[PDB]
Amino acid sequence: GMDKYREIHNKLKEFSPGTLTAVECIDYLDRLYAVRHDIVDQMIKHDWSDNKDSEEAIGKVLLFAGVPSNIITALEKKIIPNHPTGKSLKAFFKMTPDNYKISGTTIEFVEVTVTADVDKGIREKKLKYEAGLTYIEQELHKFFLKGEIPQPYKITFNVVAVRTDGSNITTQWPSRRNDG
Ligand SMILES: [Mn+3]
Ligand SMILES: [Mn+3]
Ligand SMILES: [Mn+3]
């Protein structure tokens, strides 16, 4: 990965007169990981995601899925139970998971992570999104039971974890993992 860049660097000669540094290499690896993330994200966008261009705010996805604007407003003041920082839905609705797909009142989210440690990367993304999305589902269902929306919603969160090295990817669905 960096072998290639070590060789290129050493051919720069007068235009890079210092030996390649560790800090440089770490930055360059980070740039490569960011591109890997974006390519895999584009792959999902090509033939899965409703959002073909960019990531979308959760509040906006709810609107696209038919949640009335007054319901979204009502939800904003609520605090997510068991959120690691006590985040409100007003803040949570601004967050932008990579991909979503709406099938009626089922809303699926897929977050891409590129990580050296798949288990860690999955845990990090779940910690970010999962309590909030679960809570949204619970609260929407209450509105349905009260007759204020005609159907409840199902909200799922999935993580696609792409290894930094090699072509192996781990998919975490809500109830199971598949390494690949
Ligand atoms: Mn140099
Ligand atoms: Mn993103
Ligand atoms: Mn991502």
Write the secondary structure of 54-111 as one string of H (helix), E (strand) and C (coil): CCCCHHHHHHHCCCCHHHHHHHCCCECCCCCCCCEHHHHCCCCCCEEEEECCEEEEEE
Is there a contact between 140 and 152 (Cβ–Cβ < 8 Å)? yes
Cα dihedral 117, 120, 125, 131, rounded to 10, equals 160
Q: Which ligand sits closest to the CA of 121? A: 3
Starting at the edge strand found earlier in the chain, the sheet holding 99-103 runs 99-103, 106-115, 154-163, 169-172, 177-178
Tell me which residues are annotated as active site. 125
Task: Write out the two tokens for 97.
Answer: 């998971």
**How far away, in angstroms, is 179 Cα from ligand 3 center?**
18
For ligand 1, a single-atom ion, the residues with CB < 5 A are 16, 18
- Residue 20 CA to ligand 1 center (angstroms) comes to 5
Maximum separation of any 2 CA atoms in the chain, in Å: 73
What region, left, alpha or beta, does residue 6 occupy, with left being phi > 0 and alpha being psi -120 to 50 degrees?
Answer: alpha
Q: Spell 84-97 as b/e; 16+ CB within 10 A means b.
A: eeebebeebbeeeb
Binding residues for Mn(2+): 37, 55, 98, 111-112
Is 164 in a helix, a strand, or coil? coil
- Look up tokens 């993992």; give the residue: 177
Domain count, the chain: 1
* Domain range for 125: 1-180
Two tokens, residue 162: 């792409």
154-163 and 99-103 beta bridge pairing: unpaired
**Cα–chain center distance at 3:** 30
Residue 36 backbone phi and psi in degrees, to 5: -60, -45
Q: Cα separation of 175 and 170, whole Å?
A: 14
Q: How far from 12 is each of 19, 23, 32, 73, CA to CA, in Å?
A: 11, 18, 20, 57
Ligand closest to 40 (CA) is: 3
Cα 167 to ligand 1 centroid, rounded to whole Å: 30
Q: What is the resolution of this structure in A?
A: 1.7
Distance 10 CA to ligand 1 centre (A): 8
Helix 2-12 crosses helix 22-47 at what angle (to 10 degrees)? Answer: 130
| Separate counts of helices (H) and strands (E) for the chain | 6, 5
Q: Is the dihedral of CA 86, 91, 97, 101 positive or negative?
A: positive
The DSSP letter of residue 20 is P
Cα angle: 160, vertex 179, 92; to 5 degrees? 30
Ligand nearest the Cα of residue 15 is: 1
Cα end-to-end distance, the chain, whole Å: 21
Rounded Cα distance between 123 and 120, Å, is 5
Distance 37 CA to ligand 3 centre (A): 7
Contacts of 157 (CB under 8 A, 6+ apart): 97, 109, 111, 126, 129, 130, 133, 174
